[PDB]
From Swiss-Prot, chain A:
Its main location: mitochondrion. Coiled coil: none annotated. Core subunit of the mitochondrial membrane respiratory chain NADH dehydrogenase (Complex I) which catalyzes electron transfer from NADH through the respiratory chain, using ubiquinone as an electron acceptor. Essential for the catalytic activity and assembly of complex I. It comes from Ovis aries (Sheep). This is NADH-ubiquinone oxidoreductase chain 2. GO terms for biological process: mitochondrial electron transport, NADH to ubiquinone; mitochondrial respiratory chain complex I assembly; reactive oxygen species metabolic process. Its EC number is 7.1.1.2. It is found in: Mitochondrion inner membrane. Keywords: Electron transport, Membrane, Mitochondrion, Mitochondrion inner membrane, NAD, Respiratory chain, Translocase, Transmembrane, Transmembrane helix, Transport, Ubiquinone. GO terms for molecular function: NADH dehydrogenase (ubiquinone) activity. It holds the Pfam family NADH_dehy_S2_C. GO terms for cellular component: mitochondrial inner membrane; respiratory chain complex I.
Curated annotation (Swiss-Prot), chain E:
It is a multi-pass membrane protein. It holds the Pfam family Oxidored_q4. The gene is MT-ND3. Its EC number is 7.1.1.2. InterPro entries: NADH_UbQ/plastoQ_OxRdtase_su3, NDAH_ubi_oxred_su3_sf. It catalyses: a ubiquinone + NADH + 5 H(+)(in) = a ubiquinol + NAD(+) + 4 H(+)(out). It comes from the Eukaryota. Gene3D superfamilies: NADH:ubiquinone/plastoquinone oxidoreductase, chain 3. The lineage of its organism: Eukaryota, Metazoa, Chordata, Craniata, Vertebrata. It is found in: Mitochondrion inner membrane. It comes from Ovis aries. Belongs to the complex I subunit 3 family. Core subunit of the mitochondrial membrane respiratory chain NADH dehydrogenase (Complex I) which catalyzes electron transfer from NADH through the respiratory chain, using ubiquinone as an electron acceptor. Essential for the catalytic activity of complex I. GO terms for cellular component: mitochondrial inner membrane; respiratory chain complex I. This is NADH-ubiquinone oxidoreductase chain 3.
UniProtKB/Swiss-Prot annotation, chain F:
The chain crosses the membrane at residues 2-22, 68-88, 100-120, 147-167, 172-192, 210-230, 246-266, 287-307. Belongs to the complex I subunit 1 family. One of its GO terms (biological process) is mitochondrial electron transport, NADH to ubiquinone. One of its GO terms (molecular function) is NADH dehydrogenase (ubiquinone) activity. It catalyses: a ubiquinone + NADH + 5 H(+)(in) = a ubiquinol + NAD(+) + 4 H(+)(out). This is NADH-ubiquinone oxidoreductase chain 1. The lineage of its organism: Eukaryota, Metazoa, Chordata, Craniata, Vertebrata. One of its GO terms (cellular component) is respiratory chain complex I. It comes from the Eukaryota. Core subunit of the mitochondrial membrane respiratory chain NADH dehydrogenase (Complex I) that is believed to belong to the minimal assembly required for catalysis. Complex I functions in the transfer of electrons from NADH to the respiratory chain. The immediate electron acceptor for the enzyme is believed to be ubiquinone. Keywords: Electron transport, Membrane, Mitochondrion, Mitochondrion inner membrane, NAD, Respiratory chain, Translocase, Transmembrane, Transmembrane helix, Transport, Ubiquinone. HAMAP family: NDH1_NuoH.
Swiss-Prot record, chain G:
The chain crosses the membrane at residues 1-21, 29-49, 61-81. It is found in: Mitochondrion inner membrane. Its EC number is 7.1.1.2. GO terms for cellular component: mitochondrial inner membrane; respiratory chain complex I. It comes from Ovis aries (Sheep). The keyword Mitochondrion applies. Belongs to the complex I subunit 4L family. One of its GO terms (molecular function) is NADH dehydrogenase (ubiquinone) activity. It is a multi-pass membrane protein. The gene is MT-ND4L. The keyword Nucleotide-binding does not apply. Keywords: Electron transport, Membrane, Mitochondrion, Mitochondrion inner membrane, NAD, Respiratory chain, Translocase, Transmembrane, Transmembrane helix, Transport, Ubiquinone. Core subunit of the mitochondrial membrane respiratory chain NADH dehydrogenase (Complex I) which catalyzes electron transfer from NADH through the respiratory chain, using ubiquinone as an electron acceptor. Part of the enzyme membrane arm which is embedded in the lipid bilayer and involved in proton translocation. Core subunit of respiratory chain NADH dehydrogenase (Complex I) which is composed of 45 different subunits. This is NADH-ubiquinone oxidoreductase chain 4L.
Amino acid sequence: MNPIILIIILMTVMLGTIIVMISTHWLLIWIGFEMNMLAIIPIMMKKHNPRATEASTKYFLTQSTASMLLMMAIIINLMFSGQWTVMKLFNPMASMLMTMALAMKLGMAPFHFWVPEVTQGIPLSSGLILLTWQKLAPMSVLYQILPSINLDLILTLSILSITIGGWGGLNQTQLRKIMAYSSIAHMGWMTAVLLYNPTMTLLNLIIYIIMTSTMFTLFMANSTTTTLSLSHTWNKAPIMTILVLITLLSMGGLPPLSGFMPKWMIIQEMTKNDSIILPTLMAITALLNLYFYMRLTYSTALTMFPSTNNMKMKWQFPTTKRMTLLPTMTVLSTMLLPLTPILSILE
Amino acid sequence: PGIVELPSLEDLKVQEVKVSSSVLKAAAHHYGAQCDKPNKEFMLCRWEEKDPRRCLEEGKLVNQCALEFFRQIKRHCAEPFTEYWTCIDYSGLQLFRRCRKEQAQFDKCVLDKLGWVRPDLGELSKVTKVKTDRPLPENPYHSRARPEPNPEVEGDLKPARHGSRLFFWTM
Amino acid sequence: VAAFLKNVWAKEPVLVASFAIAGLAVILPTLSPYTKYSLMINRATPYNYPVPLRDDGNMPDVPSHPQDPQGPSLEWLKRL
Amino acid sequence: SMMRWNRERRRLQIEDFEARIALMPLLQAEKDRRVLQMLRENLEEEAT
Amino acid sequence: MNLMITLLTNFTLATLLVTIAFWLPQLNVYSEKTSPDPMGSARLPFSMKFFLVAITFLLFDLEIALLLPLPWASQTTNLNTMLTMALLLIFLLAVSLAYEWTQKGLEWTE
Amino acid sequence: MFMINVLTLIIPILLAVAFLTLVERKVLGYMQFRKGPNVVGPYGLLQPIADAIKLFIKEPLRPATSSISMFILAPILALTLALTMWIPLPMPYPLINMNLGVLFMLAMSSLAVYSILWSGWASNSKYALIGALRAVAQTISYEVTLAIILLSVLLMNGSFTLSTLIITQEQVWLIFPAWPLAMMWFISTLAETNRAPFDLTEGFNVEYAAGPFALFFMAEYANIIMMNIFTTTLFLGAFHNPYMPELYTINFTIKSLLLSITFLWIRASYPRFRYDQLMHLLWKNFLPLTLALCMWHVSLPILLSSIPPQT
Amino acid sequence: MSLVYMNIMMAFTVSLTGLLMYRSHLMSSLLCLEGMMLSLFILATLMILNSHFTLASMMPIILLVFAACEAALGLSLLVMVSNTYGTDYVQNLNLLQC
Amino acid sequence: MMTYIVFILSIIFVMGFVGFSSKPSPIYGGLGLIVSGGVGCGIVLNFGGSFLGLMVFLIYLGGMMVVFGYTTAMATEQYPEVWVSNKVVLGTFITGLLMEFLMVYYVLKDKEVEIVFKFNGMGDWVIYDTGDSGFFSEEAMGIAALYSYGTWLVIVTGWSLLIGVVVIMEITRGN
Ligand SMILES: CCCCCCCCCCCCCCCCCC(=O)OC[C@H](COP(=O)([O-])OC[C@H](O)COP(=O)([O-])OC[C@H](COC(=O)CCCCCCCCCCCCCCCCC)OC(=O)CCCCCCCCCCCCCCCCC)OC(=O)CCCCCCCCCCCCCCCCC
Ligand SMILES: CCCCCCCCCCCCCCCCCC(=O)OC[C@H](COP(=O)([O-])OCC[N+](C)(C)C)OC(=O)CCCCCCCCCCCCCCCCC
Ligand SMILES: CCCCCCCCCCCCCCCCCC(=O)OC[C@H](COP(=O)(O)OCCN)OC(=O)CCCCCCCCCCCCCCCCC
Ligand SMILES: CCCCCCCCCCCCCCCCCC(=O)OC[C@H](COP(=O)(O)OCCN)OC(=O)CCCCCCCCCCCCCCCCC
Ligand SMILES: CCCCCCCCCCCCCCCCCC(=O)OC[C@H](COP(=O)(O)OCCN)OC(=O)CCCCCCCCCCCCCCCCC
Ligand SMILES: CCCCCCCCCCCCCCCCCC(=O)OC[C@H](COP(=O)(O)OCCN)OC(=O)CCCCCCCCCCCCCCCCC
């Protein structure tokens, strides 16, 4: 791809998300999602193999169906309110359809069935864009319509997201599918606290984006797409062996790392509202995520080490990859729990 | 809720201007010049009362002054006006520009026998002022009492008492 | 700037005519003395009823009749 | 030619619109009495 | 109503002429013909370029759909804004055509 | 009484299409230093009748259609869209007087490509389908410049109303302020109707019988006469006395006959384009000029203070 | 609720369930998706015309433009799939099972 | 019956969506969606939104379903059907369309008027011509205010169309 065309298309992705964030009119919300989808499709087809075309097709179909359901929600709101302000909705039918459409856009379960496939088919940088930047616009719309969101619906989608994103990561050796099921679990955590305190939603979204970008930046820096290929990193770049894995200890949510901060603040703000069963069971399923991701940590900085001979040739070459913000993102994703009351800046 | 209050059918009886649309359009500019004051009183009453039930007598004055206008045409300039609205009436879009000689003869007979100058281009679309003797409607929308707003913040901003108070963080 | 222009008017006169007409269409209405009259004609075209004002007692510019001297004029439009 | 004739057509449009404006109070009074007549007829038939 | 009556008349005349032009030569008992192309029997080859000209049509047709209310847009009171947005829409249609040019998109059906 | 008006529209359309075949064969005859038909009728007046009776009793080609439904609906849609393009035409008064008659004709002419596409798919041949796809791509390419030229001229009309376009041209023919739009419009109408030098289909619906081929042929000629009448009304607007409308009718009929004969005289004068040459002619020649003149006719009535009225 | 809007929503849901039940082709999926867009156009148009709400008259045109650009994107994706495999079958799009 | 023409066209619209949504083939699905677009355009035109219905015919059916049929003809390889003499090749077509229009009549049965006559739509349905608008269409002026009022909407729409051109030329090159 021509780098000018790449810059213009990435600015169009960013512009679509900014248009969703700043606009007060529902048609401009729908326009921002259309522009965001249209612009992100060539980022996925950047390498032109059949897997990226299949992934772009499945992503197009799911996001297109979600855009149509979003416009049907907007149209029902115009029926029952005669106006277009992006605020609460004035029909439970419009609220239900817009919550379903945004859950399809996030890949929350049971609309999760595209995220591991699409994340598998596309490269690591476009997978990073899809799992970090594309979450921002539907979480903004869910932030603005929360006087209308049905409680039982959003809690059902959140627990089904956390359970399916947990039980998806057992059978996986592909790193992109692991990050996709981690995405499904974390979006369930974010929408669990949405109707109680959406500042903790924004805290979980920011910490998740930092940890996800650290993991995808390390996967790009090591040229590893599978567990089996990630396990050759100790003989090639030994500082990458610890950074990937203590960032991955952050991502499951485990103290004293900063990925324990969002889940702890979510449990904290849901027990103010006299919900005790629900954060307990959601964090038990997060321990199931810890179970599988700790097995991956064992496989990379423990048992299955063995190397090949052509590592002897890779030893004579240093990295030229621009590991952009990787020490910054790695320090932010691990040592930020002593600065936990910084979360008031998101209020 | 409440009974909607409608005027009787005797409150709605007035003598009607039983002429066609080309007949109205042929005398339109002279009607706007000559019948200006009750028409403008009525349309001020109509955009202020926002209710056709509070405008019935001004509408009757409009209908009366229109009937006096057409009687005053009929007594003086019946044949040039008939010659003019017949030619206006032939057209599909009812053009003024197809009928300039009948317009000239109608304006000639009207300026001679009655002294009515046809208004220039720009005049009948002016916003005029109307002297009324009825009171201004103080609540034409019948809005009830507005909800009292939430109290604003006032006072200087003291620092947080012992900081964030988040479980053990002393600042 | 004159050798290139003759070279492109020799090679591609369709696109030279296109860029010249589009350039005139861009930078010409900013230079015309009649662009203000388009605005003045469009805002003098009475689609709505000129709703009159309640005469409070001090409005010496608002007329009482169309044929009164005060008020906006369209003699510039009849003359031009 | 189109300059002269479209200016003339705008003046003829303004003449037609002033004819409409002069006719509007009569038509508005008749429309008011029309809809009040129809609502009163429907009210009496609702009563019977 | 007059429109729909005229449409029904045109459709009925068209279907009547099609019915006559199919049934009138079938009254002939001519013969039962036995064993009734450049390629032999192979698959239809897909051509990427025909699809590209169809999509370029669709995108410029959507830009034309944006261009259509301009004779009504000329009547506005905000004429500087209207003229700027009209010239901007036709300029973005021209930028689409220039980008379609300079990436060899209009080639072998230019 | 309205049905009398509809039939006296649509049956003289079929008669004028019938004798356009005679006029085309005679004019192509005399321009090629020969004669057209003069034996069958007195100077060929019975040639369209003999041709129509021959085409409607000829043996059907007996196709194995890929679809029954599209094989039947492609001539029906071709004839219906050929006949509905005539009802808003102000000659001087339209049969159906509508506010958006220009836009109506543009929409019904955009619908006309489905007869080509369905006729090409409803045959078993792949070469017929390839020819139909090339014809559809040609037609959709030239509809772009149709729409943009038409919008640019309607910026002098004031509305989409066809009857207003006579009022627009009461002082000057509209070809005088818009002759480049007129000539690109004329070649674009020449390329809409698959007409030489743009008839590459004769260099898609050859699965049909002689009867249905006559139906596609007469839909094509109704489109040709219609587009010439529309171009006459659009650029060469006749004088309309509202008391004697037959003056306008004689005047636009003479002008539309001259423009149809100009189609006949262009097909007898030029070699055909190669397919990419007319794709080039659209996309790289007519379309930049069309966008530039569209900018020019947007911005010109604002700089001349000559914006036409909406009504 | 209102009468014709129930029909337009029912058409939307029928085309939804057509998109939500794949039979054979990706083109049929794009057809059901654009039928959903058509029903959205009709429903938005009937509301905005019924309400006499003037500035939303430009809304369904923008709906049509953005979603037909979306459909052009879908047709290009289908073409790249059909050039990969030969057909546009949805069962040829299953390499992301593993 | 003639009062209820918008409801009848909506019933035809729902039946056409049932027609192509059951998906016999993408080509017959495209044909059913063309017919459904025409009758839904008739629904729009029978409120008085004439520019929006002509936008349906000119843009939806005129460009987009053309490109859908054009793309569909370049896939899904054709095969013949029954072609026996004119009773079978056209008489079965006439009887099939007669059964389809008799189905359009047959879905309007006594179980339907229980929804119709209880919630009578006509009598007060199309309230578009309630009073006077003036010398304009409100629909046309609201569409025309895309240029004076809708500046941001024009910017984002034209930018998305330019980006659409760029995006199609990137993903179709295959390199
Ligand atoms: C006259 C003008 C000039 C005056 C100048 C006066 C000062 C002169 C010296 C200038 C420099 C001043 C430095 C800061 C002042 C002292 C702060 C302090 O000790 O706070 C006590 C703080 C609370 O104790 P306190 O008795 O209640 O308060 C005494 C004061 O009133 C404390 O005041 P406070 O109560 O207002 O403090 C507010 C609040 C007080 O704290 C709280 O409210 C409690 C919550 C604190 C966070 C707990 C998070 C637990 C979960 C995460 C654990 C992470 C893993 C641990 C570290 C692993 C290794 C990296 O602070 C925080 O929440 C901040 C977060 C903790 C950072 C503390 C400052 C670190 C600066 C240097 C960092 C170097 C790396 C050390 C390791 C990084 C972690 C500390 O102690 C702790 O939280 C325990 C950790 C130890 C604190 C850091 C000690 C700093 C010196 C380190 C030297 C050795 C470095 C070795 C190499 C690098 C490491 C391998
Ligand atoms: C509607 C009534 C009738 C109207 C007239 C039409 C009837 C006459 C028809 C004649 C026979 C045509 C038969 C078909 C021919 C098709 C081929 C053909 O003509 O191709 C078109 C040719 C194509 O060009 P070409 O192919 O010859 O050139 C080669 C092109 N390159 C280099 C790219 C390979 O020309 C055009 O496209 C021009 C169209 C008309 C443009 C009019 C411009 C007007 C002047 C503008 C201003 C100029 C000065 C610059 C600005 C100054 C500012 C101060
Ligand atoms: C409430 C919150 C509101 C919003 C606040 C801000 C949110 C920020 C969200 C960040 C989302 C990041 C999305 C991904 C980066 C975007 C730019 C991009 O495309 O980078 C990838 C790029 C591709 O280059 P390419 O040529 O494809 O290389 C492949 C090899 N040939 O280049 C590469 O591959 C180079 C390798 C390194 C890439 C590192 C990218 C890191 C980006 C994230 C930084 C951390 C997030 C910011 C801080 C927290 C914000 C919440
Ligand atoms: C500012 C106003 C708005 C301007 C933008 C809108 C214009 C309206 C028309 C839109 C045209 C869209 C397509 C333009 C593409 C330009 C690039 C191009 O075509 O380059 C190739 C061409 C050489 O042609 P070639 O590649 O060989 O094609 C085969 C046939 N020979 O190379 C060329 O032909 C060179 C083309 C560029 C140079 C033309 C210079 C004309 C200058 C006229 C005087 C100045 C007018 C004012 C405007 C500024 C122009 C710089
Ligand atoms: C808006 C205007 C539309 C106009 C449409 C029509 C255009 C054509 C106008 C007329 C052209 C010429 C008509 C005459 C043609 C020649 C007829 C003829 O001469 O037939 C002779 C033939 C044999 O006769 P026989 O008895 O053998 O003679 C031997 C003599 N010792 O005997 C026969 O063949 C038998 C008799 C046949 C007569 C045919 C007459 C012409 C039929 C035309 C049909 C349409 C008429 C117009 C309809 C619309 C207007 C009302
Ligand atoms: C396989 C099926 C059969 C295929 C062959 C036959 C069908 C295809 C060919 C014919 C297509 C017909 C298209 C008709 C609608 C065109 C747009 C239209 O109605 O424009 C006319 C007019 C708009 O002008 P305006 O002046 O604004 O309105 C009058 C108010 N003064 O608006 C009016 O005057 C409104 C009048 C009432 C509304 C009539 C709407 C049309 C009838 C319903 C749809 C019929 C066609 C369905 C199938 C379409 C193709 C699939």
